[PDB]
Amino acid sequence: EIQLMHNLGKHLNSMERVEWLRKKLQDVHNFVAL
């Protein structure tokens, strides 16, 4: 498979990952969207 990157994000980059993980905790109980 493809496993040769540290903190990539799957469908985003490192600068997106840092915020991706921030939303990961603030989105479990919804983020005022739907």
Q: CA 21, 32, 28, 12 torsion: positive or negative?
A: negative
The experimental method behind these coordinates is NMR
Tell me the C-alpha to C-alpha distance, in Å, between residue 30 and each of 9, 12, 17, 23. 20, 20, 19, 10
Instruction: Read off φ and ψ for residue 32, nearest 5 degrees.
Output: 45, 45
Q: Which helix (H) or strand (E) holds 22?
A: helix 14-26
Do residues 20 and 9 make contact, with C-beta atoms less than 8 angstroms apart? yes
Q: What per-residue string of b and e applies to 11-27 under the rule 16 or more CB within 10 Å gives b? A: eeeeeebeebeeeeeee
Using DSSP's 3-state secondary structure scheme, residue 4 falls into: coil
The length of the chain is 34
Q: What is the Cα–Cα distance from 15 to 3, expressed in whole angstroms?
A: 19
Tell me the C-alpha to C-alpha distance, in Å, between residue 2 and each of 12, 15, 34. 15, 20, 34
